[PDB]
Design a protein around this ligand. Structure first.
Ligand SMILES: [Cs+]
Ligand SMILES: [Cs+]
Ligand SMILES: [Cs+]
Ligand SMILES: [Cs+]
Length: 138
């Protein structure tokens, strides 16, 4: 039972999706920019990811820049509500499986929560080797 909050225009997100698929399951794909999680869902996701709210914030996007989010003047809940109101602020990809939830940055973090091993070697789209045919992480 796998869900990925995906951005098809992001290489990290594409590589993570192809590793989910190479473990033998097709995930539910949520295009978070157009359908972001709700507030309770977002809070849960963050809790399950084990990271700070601030660590999920994408920098180098318009709302982060124009809202001055780089400055330490925001509570966690203010940052969560900015994420709900401006979903491009949610970094990507977020993957949820029966084993847990992770911000998969870098993409191979997803190997921690995939239940089934990669079915064969996996090489990222830019040629970076991740797992060899034997299944060893490179
Ligand atoms: Cs939602
Ligand atoms: Cs695993
Ligand atoms: Cs293998
Ligand atoms: Cs890259």
């Amino acid at each position: 039972n796998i869900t990925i909050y995906h951005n098809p225009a992001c290489g990290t997100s594409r590589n993570t999706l192809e590793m989910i698929r190479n473990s033998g399951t097709e995930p539910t794909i949520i295009l978070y920019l157009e359908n972001p999680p709700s507030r309770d869902e977002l809070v849960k996701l963050i809790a399950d990811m084990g990271i700070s709210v601030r660590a999920l914030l994408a920098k180098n996007v318009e709302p982060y820049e124009q809202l001055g989010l780089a400055e330490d003047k925001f509570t966690d809940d203010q940052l969560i509500d900015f994420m709900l109101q401006h979903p491009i602020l949610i970094n990507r990809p977020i993957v949820v499986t029966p084993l847990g939830t992770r911000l998969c940055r870098p993409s191979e973090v997803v190997l921690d929560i995939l239940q089934d091993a990669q079915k064969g070697a996996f090489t990222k789209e830019d040629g970076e080797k991740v797992v060899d045919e034997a299944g060893k992480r490179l």
